[PDB]
Ligand binder design. Structure first.
Ligand SMILES: [Ca+2]
Ligand SMILES: [Ca+2]
Ligand SMILES: [Zn+2]
Length: 153
């Protein structure tokens, strides 16, 4: 398989387009009507940084959890002794773009547990094969992956 290049995104369209992760609905806050859309991920095969000490990095939508758990398995098989690591999941800090999918729990920023940057291009490729709807080699320090929202009723 072929790693992504720095700043490459797949599919090669903007994140919030139909063919990628789709439109932003709105920010989910902790005491909001939509907080129930988020579920915590307690997978022992994923390392969550949780530098906030709030557990926010673990909260995500069901589709996000499904793709992330699949990626966790492929990371361990690619590099024995290494695990998937999440540095950002749902965000309440306002530390992303104004309509970031992190605010809806539909995006994660990821690394490997060893923080070996030489692996990140391949990590991004694994995220694509794990089925994330948009994958962006955003920083030398992390990959940004997002998923579609569930369909309206
Ligand atoms: Ca974090
Ligand atoms: Ca955060
Ligand atoms: Zn991100």
């Amino acid at each position: 398989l072929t790693p992504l290049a720095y700043k490459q995104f797949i599919p090669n369209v903007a994140e919030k387009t139909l063919g990628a992760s789709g439109r932003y609905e709105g920010k989910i806050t902790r005491n909001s009507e939509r907080f129930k859309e988020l579920t915590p991920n307690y997978n022992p095969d994923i390392i969550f940084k949780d530098e906030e000490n709030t557990g926010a990095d673990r909260l995500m939508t069901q589709r996000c959890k499904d793709k992330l758990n699949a990626l966790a398995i492929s990371v361990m098989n690619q590099w024995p002794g290494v695990k998937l690591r999440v540095t950002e999941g749902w965000d309440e800090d306002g530390h992303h773009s104004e309509e970031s999918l992190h605010y809806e729990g539909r995006a994660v920023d990821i690394t490997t547990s060893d923080r070996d940057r030489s692996k990140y291009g391949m990590l991004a490729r694994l995220a694509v094969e794990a089925g994330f709807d948009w994958v962006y080699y955003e920083s030398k320090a992390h990959i940004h992956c997002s998923v579609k929202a569930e369909n309206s009723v």
